Amino acid sequence: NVAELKKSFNRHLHFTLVKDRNVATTRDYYFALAHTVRDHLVGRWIRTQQHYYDKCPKRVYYLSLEFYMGRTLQNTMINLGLQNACDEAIYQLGLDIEELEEIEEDAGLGNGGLGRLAACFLDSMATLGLAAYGYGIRYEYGIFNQKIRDGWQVEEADDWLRYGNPWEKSRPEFMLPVHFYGKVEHTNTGTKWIDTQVVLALPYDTPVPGYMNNTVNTMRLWSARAPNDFDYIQAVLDRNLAENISRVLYPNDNFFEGKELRLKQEYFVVAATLQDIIRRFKASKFTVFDAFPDQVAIQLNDTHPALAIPELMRIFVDIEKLPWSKAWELTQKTFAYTNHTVLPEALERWPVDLVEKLLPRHLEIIYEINQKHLDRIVALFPKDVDRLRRMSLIEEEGSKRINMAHLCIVGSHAVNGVAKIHSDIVKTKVFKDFSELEPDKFQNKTNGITPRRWLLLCNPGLAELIAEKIGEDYVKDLSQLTKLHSFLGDDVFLRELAKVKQENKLKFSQFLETEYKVKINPSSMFDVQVKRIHEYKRQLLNCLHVITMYNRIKKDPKKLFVPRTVIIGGKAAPGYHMAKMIIKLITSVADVVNNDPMVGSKLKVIFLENYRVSLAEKVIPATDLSEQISTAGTEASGTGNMKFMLNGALTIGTMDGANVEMAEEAGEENLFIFGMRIDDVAALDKKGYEAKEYYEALPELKLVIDQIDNGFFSPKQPDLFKDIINMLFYHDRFKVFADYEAYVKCQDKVSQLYMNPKAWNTMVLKNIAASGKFSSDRTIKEYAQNIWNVEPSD
Amino acid sequence: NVAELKKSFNRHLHFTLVKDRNVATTRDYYFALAHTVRDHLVGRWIRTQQHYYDKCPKRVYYLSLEFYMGRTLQNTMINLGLQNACDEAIYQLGLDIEELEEIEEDAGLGNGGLGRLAACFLDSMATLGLAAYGYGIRYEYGIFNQKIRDGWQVEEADDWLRYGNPWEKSRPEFMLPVHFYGKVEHTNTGTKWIDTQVVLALPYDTPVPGYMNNTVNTMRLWSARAPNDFDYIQAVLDRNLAENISRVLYPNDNFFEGKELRLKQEYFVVAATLQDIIRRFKASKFTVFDAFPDQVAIQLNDTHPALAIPELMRIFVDIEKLPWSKAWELTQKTFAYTNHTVLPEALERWPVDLVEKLLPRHLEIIYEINQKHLDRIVALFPKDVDRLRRMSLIEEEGSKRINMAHLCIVGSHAVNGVAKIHSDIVKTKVFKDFSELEPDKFQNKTNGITPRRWLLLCNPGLAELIAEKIGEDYVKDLSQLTKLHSFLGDDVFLRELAKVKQENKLKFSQFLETEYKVKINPSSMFDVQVKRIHEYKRQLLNCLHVITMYNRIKKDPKKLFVPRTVIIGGKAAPGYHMAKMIIKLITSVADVVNNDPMVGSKLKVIFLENYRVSLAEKVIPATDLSEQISTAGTEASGTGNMKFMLNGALTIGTMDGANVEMAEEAGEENLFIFGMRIDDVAALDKKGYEAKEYYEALPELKLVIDQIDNGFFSPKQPDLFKDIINMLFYHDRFKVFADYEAYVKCQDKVSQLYMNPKAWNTMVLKNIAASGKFSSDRTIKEYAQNIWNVEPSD
Numbered sequence A, B: 001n002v003a004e005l006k007k008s009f010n011r012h013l014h015f016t017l018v019k020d021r022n023v024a025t026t027r028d029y030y031f032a033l034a035h036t037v038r039d040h041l042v043g044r045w046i047r048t049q050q051h052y053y054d055k056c057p058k059r060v061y062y063l064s065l066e067f068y069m070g071r072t073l074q075n076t077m078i079n080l081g082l083q084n085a086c087d088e089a090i091y092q093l094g095l096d097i098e099e100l101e102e103i104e105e106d107a108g109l110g111n112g113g114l115g116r117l118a119a120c121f122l123d124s125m126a127t128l129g130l131a132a133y134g135y136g137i138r139y140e141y142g143i144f145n146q147k148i149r150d151g152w153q154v155e156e157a158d159d160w161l162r163y164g165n166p167w168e169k170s171r172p173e174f175m176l177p178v179h180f181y182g183k184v185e186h187t188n189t190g191t192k193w194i195d196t197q198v199v200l201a202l203p204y205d206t207p208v209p210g211y212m213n214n215t216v217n218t219m220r221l222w223s224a225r226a227p228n229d230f231d232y233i234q235a236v237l238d239r240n241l242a243e244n245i246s247r248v249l250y251p252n253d254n255f256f257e258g259k260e261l262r263l264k265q266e267y268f269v270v271a272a273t274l275q276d277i278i279r280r281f282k283a284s285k286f287t288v289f290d291a292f293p294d295q296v297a298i299q300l301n302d303t304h305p306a307l308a309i310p311e312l313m314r315i316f317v318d319i320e321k322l323p324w325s326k327a328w329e330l331t332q333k334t335f336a337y338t339n340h341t342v343l344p345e346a347l348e349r350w351p352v353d354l355v356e357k358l359l360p361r362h363l364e365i366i367y368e369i370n371q372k373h374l375d376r377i378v379a380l381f382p383k384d385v386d387r388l389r390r391m392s393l394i395e396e397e398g399s400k401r402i403n404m405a406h407l408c409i410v411g412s413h414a415v416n417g418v419a420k421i422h423s424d425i426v427k428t429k430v431f432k433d434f435s436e437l438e439p440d441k442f443q444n445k446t447n448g449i450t451p452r453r454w455l456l457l458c459n460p461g462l463a464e465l466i467a468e469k470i471g472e473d474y475v476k477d478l479s480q481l482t483k484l485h486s487f488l489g490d491d492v493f494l495r496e497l498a499k500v501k502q503e504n505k506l507k508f509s510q511f512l513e514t515e516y517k518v519k520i521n522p523s524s525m526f527d528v529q530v531k532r533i534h535e536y537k538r539q540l541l542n543c544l545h546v547i548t549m550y551n552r553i554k555k556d557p558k559k560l561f562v563p564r565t566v567i568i569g570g571k572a573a574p575g576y577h578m579a580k581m582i583i584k585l586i587t588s589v590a591d592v593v594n595n596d597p598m599v600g601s602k603l604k605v606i607f608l609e610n611y612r613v614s615l616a617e618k619v620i621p622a623t624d625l626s627e628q629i630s631t632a633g634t635e636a637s638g639t640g641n642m643k644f645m646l647n648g649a650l651t652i653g654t655m656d657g658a659n660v661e662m663a664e665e666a667g668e669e670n671l672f673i674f675g676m677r678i679d680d681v682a683a684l685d686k687k688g689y690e691a692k693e694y695y696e697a698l699p700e701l702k703l704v705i706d707q708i709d710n711g712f713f714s715p716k717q718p719d720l721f722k723d724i725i726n727m728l729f730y731h732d733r734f735k736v737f738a739d740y741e742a743y744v745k746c747q748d749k750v751s752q753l754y755m756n757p758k759a760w761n762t763m764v765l766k767n768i769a770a771s772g773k774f775s776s777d778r779t780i781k782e783y784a785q786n787i788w789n790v791e792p793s794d
């Protein structure tokens, strides 16, 4: 109750912050409230973990180099049923809760969809009350902070832990050695890894509260420490190198960069996690190891934690002294692999020299794994020499590299894609060789998003509305949102829905106006593309359509033009050149567009800085139009798309990733789908893509290109954007021009629907009403049932 | 009372440590109590700090690169008067109170005498209710942990913070920029210090509980961070370099090491501190700095923060735009300097080259000071061409250096030494050129220790006994120990006092044998020498006496030997070769002596690994004879000496430092004074030191030296102590041999007296009852009256 939360608050401000109202900072207040809310989950946290130890359910271990968590405070209140009481307590003390909430750093330990998938899943597994753990790296620096200076992305260290983090508790008793380098002896007592350099792994536990149940699971992130025995001053300074491992998240989205530190990160998180799991299994009730796969599941979050396979084997054979065949039966039965990667350059392949010098034993074990593997292939295909090098874990040509996917495929009992279409290509095409051998191993699990964070928290208006119509069951069972179909003809419900959208718009319009000094037309269409910047996602194409909108105003200023506020956001990897260019182009266009007095309030372009979990929560609920426009074949699933759908936006995009499943659910009539489908893409590769042909064929495209290339957007470097021009014309893998017309045409349909409130909101409601599939609660049921084989409990 | 303490402890264990009783670790329990205890000073801390904000009395800032704090928990309990009740609470919960206490890390952020002086000072300024603050660096790594391995010193990093520190509260709101490098620009707005690299300074507060009053003063310690703004991974890894500024404490006792990083440390703390003071001053109720010196004193703990002088000037002139002359009058009035050393090699003397690179503005301000300095020497000494070079701040040979001592002298209103003999020599000899001009500038302020850590804490037995006899008011006014004179008659007493000391040697003997392979004779005379390993402190001269003794059982195994445990402990600077060998020797000697079955239990020799504050709290109360044997004129004061006086041991030592003053106080017949006085060393230098004379001249010495050199103590390597011997005959500036004879004869009388229980304890009593002068409480009044001009309120 209120009075008690108020007494807790003051107690913390007093004792934990050593402050009285008189000189208390806003941060002092945030902290005091966090501690008050965190205190309210301790009992359930102990009891949950206690129950796991007493009843030994099969535990699920989600293993990942990335947990894109965002802020905890508000998410935690909501899931404890505490938000309203806290709101009121804080209000009564003359403070503003939204103000305190603003203080919190994001836990930006993620790049995008892969890392955010991890986050939604933990929330989901806690809500369904599974025995689940999150395991990854406690990066000192998460994804970097993005400033824009002269329309250019600028990186600033995400110093997220400067002031401390009250959502983590260290665990001094569970520190582990992790080993690197050294050499292998195959003595007559077992094979032994010796003369290694040691890093210590200190774990931190973070509470994963379930939505209104009694479960609080754990996320355990590891930290790098130097040992005490593995110039005096320099020696002590040198301890920096060991602790460097957990220092900074690699900021690459969908790109492999074969850096040594990264390899160290990957073993580091694998090694400590695997010990902790064995330790726990051994400390429990339960070749006592025969029960291990009845008590352990390890989901590989892409190939990043791939070493987990040769590591488990290493532990089983060398320490546990199990015979290799047994060790391998159990490895296969413990692991499952989730494939998210699509393009050649994202594929992790590690050079053999590197894997040999850093981890000799793992190399040996990997070769051994490979031998057993290629043996079986020879046996079923003796005249087939090419199938051998094709399915080998070693890409034997030149450099020589380990194909971590191949390793995950052979060490796991289940392999999965993240959307129907994708798993499909994965199974029938990309892995034809392996799936032929065991069709049943390969499955789909279409992606999902938590409707806690992504409806309840980021959008309480909608949540309340929906709840006032159909009650609150939908939160824990999003399929219940179909009940809304029975409100389609409800003229008054449509108004309340539009009102909700408009408040989100008004609020967010404040944000834009107070952060960018740019006049927002409150009633224009909020047309939003937020994701990481990559040529495949095609921010560029959107950008082109912006230019077309602008020109259309210029040629004919009196002509009926539906006002849009066009928002583009997301971070470019610091080494991704073309991505940085694509940013500079957008900010350039905005400068022209936002100041051309002849357009004024008809068109406003914002490039949205420092896009991240807590910003997604702001902008998404405020959106009318969700840009989702990758080249078909290039987007494994996507999740933003889903979050827009649930929050009352209409989606414009290609038949790619889960967009396809969105269209099935709500019916294509109710999305703005356009463009080449995968076939249309292949057929164009077959015949051959000539970018030129479209530039001559479409006069509006011709102008846009000409404007960009001749400095209309860059009079001080008329040829600033040349690199974009070349790529567009000669090296564009993603066929930007081939989809232009279809896109623009499709854009004009959105425009016309927008001029009919009733039709538009009717489509909105048919979307929201069908968004239920996309709850990460459904996804997890599916993983639980056909992969982990654990049951929900409560 | 106790019931609230049990609740609180449990609330912490539950809510702060997230543990129930059956899985709580020991660390868990420690923290739970620690937090409980901190809570109980919070009120007195806020009020003490409020109250200075209110009445606004003059503030004392003790600025030191070093704070040798030791452990906090028990000191805090005692001073807060809650040891009783806390003991109970822990007991009633079935927990070992002292096992808890042993979890706590020494805050080992000093080398020895200097950093412990500061730590005692804090306790006393708080006990006397001064508005005082300590400013230093939050070193990530304190003085190194010493391990003896094969009789050698090995160093381990002192990772005191890895499990966190319950006694500090970060103050993020008071974070600051410090500036480095760049270059000076002489524009017509004045001098701009430009293109500087910025390091962040983040303060952390530790409570300083006065003894049984209302005062809780603050110790602010600063940590280095990289700023905000900048190969991206590499750029991020490189933040390590800015943070290296506060990473490790330099481990030289009485020795100057001119490393760039150390200069950075020195600037860092001076810069953060001076800003923070200015901030506090402007924030109070006082562009008007006239009252600054009335509001603020800053004591320069030796020359380490000398840089504060030209920083304050720079702030005043460059930033506050005050006239040089005024800005200068204010500085001298603010600062005061405590000289702590006389060894030429311990004087800080910075290459201008380095200072010009790192602090180009500061170099100028120093020149500019020297100029103005040197000018007014010409006005009074127009023909003394030599006087100038003798008094300039700049030593001009080859690559010029900055004489930081001289700097501190010109820039402070008071310069003081740390004992009568020291200060006297500082005034009349070392800085005669200066003192002649302002005789009143130079003073003495004799060192002391706190009777809290060093009596009630470490030796509860002795304090209990004293309190029984004379009331418990001696704890706040030590001089009341004179009262214990009434008891010179009393044998009941004398036997009671002997009891206590025996009880300590027992406790201590149990710990001692459970460490080293050695059979301890618990009623032998405990001959303890502990302090940093130094040629000057002459642990060697002690080692020579130890051999001597052993050679007197080998010669005559059936003559009466007064039996003694000889304990020598201390850390050698990693870079200090002689001291490392000297340790090696003592351990060799140790291994020969403890394994001659003939010597048996007559003489055990123990080298005490890892001497530090909490270790000192154990061995001192268990001591009979205190070795204070530095060459006359080398120990500026000593503070070990005083601790052993307070704790019921008798002193064997030279007429050096405060020894002179302990003798003074107790009567010189009540200490074992011996060997060369100050003039004797003076004489011998002019006559010339000729070591071989005592080797020829003295048969008993001669054996000792031959054993060493021919390898009696290193058989498997008869060559080992080559350099010890060489040093001793052609290089020993500290004249071990010249006092060899006086010393041994002196020891012989100690031995003679130890066979007289009654006379011995009568001398021990005469020592304890006259130790009142040496309370740091007395030292502080004196600075308060005569340097800081502040008033002992509460």
Ligand SMILES: O=C(NC(=O)c1cc(F)c(F)cc1Cl)Nc1ccc(C(=O)O)cc1OC(F)(F)F
Pocket: A045, A046, A048, A049, A050, A051, A053, A169, A170, A171, A205, A206, B017, B018, B019, B020, B022, B023
């Ligand atoms: O009290 C606890 N605390 C925690 O486990 C805990 C500690 C943390 F530092 C943290 F950050 C998070 C958590 Cl959740 N656990 C517990 C209680 C009782 C028992 C029993 O078996 O009686 C066994 C127990 O350990 C386990 F984990 F098995 F439940």
Ligand SMILES: O=C(NC(=O)c1cc(F)c(F)cc1Cl)Nc1ccc(C(=O)O)cc1OC(F)(F)F
Pocket: A017, A018, A019, A020, A022, A023, B045, B046, B048, B049, B050, B051, B053, B169, B170, B171, B205
């Ligand atoms: O609330 C406080 N807290 C502290 O001072 C403090 C904060 C810490 F984080 C810490 F680690 C230690 C302390 Cl001791 N102080 C205060 C109260 C009331 C007033 C008024 O003027 O009404 C002014 C005040 O500030 C000042 F500094 F003056 F004491």
Ligand SMILES: *C(=O)c1c(COP(=O)(O)O)cnc(C)c1O
Pocket: A111, A112, A113, A116, A117, A530, A531, A532, A611, A612, A613, A616, A638, A639, A640, A641
């Ligand atoms: C949401 O999943 C999310 C992503 C992924 O969005 P896309 O599915 O790539 O469009 C990236 N960044 C943030 C902050 C998220 O919330």
Ligand SMILES: *C(=O)c1c(COP(=O)(O)O)cnc(C)c1O
Pocket: B111, B112, B113, B114, B116, B530, B531, B532, B611, B612, B613, B614, B616, B637, B638, B639, B640, B641
């Ligand atoms: C005690 O003062 C102390 C010192 C300094 O003692 P000396 O005066 O040099 O003999 C050094 N180290 C520790 C741990 C002390 O408590």
Ligand SMILES: CC(=O)N[C@@H]1O[C@H](CO)[C@@H](O)[C@H](O)[C@H]1O
Pocket: A112, A113, A114, A115, A117, A253, A254, A340, A341, A342, A346, A418, A447, A635, A636, A637, A638, A639, A657
């Ligand atoms: C390598 C990588 O981040 N892949 C991404 O994985 C997420 C989570 O499944 C998908 O939503 C997205 O379409 C896909 O691009």
Ligand SMILES: CC(=O)N[C@@H]1O[C@H](CO)[C@@H](O)[C@H](O)[C@H]1O
Pocket: B113, B114, B117, B253, B254, B302, B340, B341, B346, B418, B447, B634, B635, B636, B637, B638, B639, B657
């Ligand atoms: C520089 C340094 O460490 N000096 C030491 O200072 C302490 C405390 O002032 C004195 O006890 C000691 O005699 C002196 O040698």
